């Protein structure tokens, strides 16, 4: 009940909506102001998805890191009581890298809904699905493909025996690929520092206090400021790694209050804030590959791109259709960000403080959690309408109507096409790609 493929992951939510890009999918639909449905008089003719993976396991090397401090606070800690008591006996049995059940069906989850919100074209229309090459991202492709096909074969409307939607193309994460979804090879952007100098700075406003009542808590035992942060990440990772998802917050959720789950999750938007969105000065750069092959999409005609975009890929019909109605990316949620921001999603957005906390108001709609949760998705609709010659490009992410910039945009979020696409002069001109080597 808490828990549904439409509203997705609204169980504990004053906990599990502030873990970031940790926190399972909820939908932001009650929270958009202007209504995600089709306006009347009004027909969708196009639709693009850009999904995150679903939820994971720890990656091998943050996983060796939680698994070696619950031992050392088994061997040193004396007190283990009241709500630390879970802690003498806990046997961290977490996987590594993998989605966990919890994430497949989320992605599962996410066909159904992305299948039903556009029934009137998925019923015949095959989408052509690409994705990052990473075991996480095309497992979830599949998952995400497995609920749209169970949907397809139970609707009376449904063109049957059309063939199967699949990963028509998976892109190399290798170092020498040119990979739009998630880029490597901006050599200057790899190198970059301001995220890990941001992140120590927010951390030394709110963690020492943290740290000192745990040490008080806990005797015997001493703590780092980043080891706090690896007891605060086991709240999502053991929440949503079990059966229990749905019944039970993890023991480790609740070692921390409400106000430092603000802060933890405040923390969590300047990760990716200045890590790969405008904070960072290369980070919306990252995103103008995805953005120029979205531009051939809507204005079905070829990419115009000397960024991320692998040109080999891109020049063929066969692995870069430009007439296919629909569409389905899967990534990770780092390119996410740079991609959202290279679009203009979020020009309404002032940099984020780095010693202070900002509300979702104060923002403008961005957050982590907001943009790329676990199991996120992006939807971008064009629409042609009755009193308008013009086809009408609108984006919803998460569940909640982004209104454009950089165009004309009207009261219900959206540009015409050929404004849309001319205010994404940012993207056309290859952003600051040119930096990535000077
Ligand atoms: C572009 O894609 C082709 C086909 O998958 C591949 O073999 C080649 O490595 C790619 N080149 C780059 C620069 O990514
Ligand atoms: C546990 O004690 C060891 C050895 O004294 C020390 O090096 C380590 O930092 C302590 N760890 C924790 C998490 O308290
Ligand atoms: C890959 O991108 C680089 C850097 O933008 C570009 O110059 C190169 O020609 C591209 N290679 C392919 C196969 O698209
Ligand atoms: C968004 O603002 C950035 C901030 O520099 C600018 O480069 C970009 O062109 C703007 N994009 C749109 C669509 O307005």
């Not at 923390?267 to 804030?273: V, W």
């Amino acid at each position: 009940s808490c828990d549904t493929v439409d509203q997705g992951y609204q169980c504990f939510s004053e906990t599990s909506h502030l873990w970031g890009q940790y926190a399972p999918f909820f939908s932001l639909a009650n929270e958009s102001v202007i209504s995600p449905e089709v306006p009347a008089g009004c027909r969708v003719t196009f639709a693009q998805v850009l999904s995150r993976h679903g939820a994971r396991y720890p990656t091998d090397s943050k996983g060796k890191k939680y698994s070696a401090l619950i031992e050392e606070i088994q061997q040193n800690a004396t007190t283990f009581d009241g709500k630390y008591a879970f802690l003498k006996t806990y046997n961290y049995s977490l996987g590594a890298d993998d989605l966990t059940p919890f994430g497949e069906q989320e992605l599962v989850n996410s066909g159904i809904k992305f299948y039903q919100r556009y029934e009137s074209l998925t019923r015949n229309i095959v989408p052509f699905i690409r994705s990052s090459g990473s075991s996480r991202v095309i497992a979830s492709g599949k998952k995400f493909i497995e609920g749209f096909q169970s949907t397809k074969l139970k609707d009376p409307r449904a063109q049957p025996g059309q063939s199967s939607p699949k990963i028509d193309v998976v892109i190399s994460e290798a170092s020498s690929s040119n990979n739009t979804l998630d880029p490597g090879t901006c050599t200057v952007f790899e190198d970059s520092e301001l995220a890990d100098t941001v992140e120590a700075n927010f951390t030394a406003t709110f963690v020492p206090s943290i740290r000192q009542r745990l040490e008080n808590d806990l005797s015997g035992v001493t703590l780092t400021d980043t080891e706090v942060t690896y007891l605060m990440d086991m709240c999502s990772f053991d929440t949503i790694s079990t059966s229990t998802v749905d019944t039970k917050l993890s023991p480790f959720c609740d070692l921390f209050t409400h106000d430092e789950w603000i802060n933890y999750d405040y923390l969590q938007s300047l990760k990716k804030y200045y890590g790969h969105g405008a904070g960072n000065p290369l980070g919306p750069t990252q995103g103008v590959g995805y953005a120029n092959e979205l531009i051939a999409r809507l204005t079905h005609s070829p990419v115009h791109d000397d960024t991320s975009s692998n040109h080999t890929l891109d020049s063929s019909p066969a692995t870069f259709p430009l007439n296919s109605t629909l569409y389905a990316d899967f990534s990770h949620d780092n390119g996410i960000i740079s991609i959202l921001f290279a679009l203009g999603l979020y020009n309404g957005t002032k940099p984020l403080s780095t010693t202070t906390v900002e509300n979702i108001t104060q923002t403008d709609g961005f957050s982590s959690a907001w943009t790329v949760p676990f199991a996120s998705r992006l939807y971008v609709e064009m629409m042609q309408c009755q009193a308008e010659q013009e086809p009408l490009v609108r984006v919803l992410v998460n569940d909640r109507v982004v209104p454009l910039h950089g165009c004309p945009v009207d009261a219900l979020g959206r540009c015409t096409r050929d404004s849309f696409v001319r205010g994404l002069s940012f993207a056309r001109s290859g952003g600051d790609w040119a930096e990535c080597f000077a």
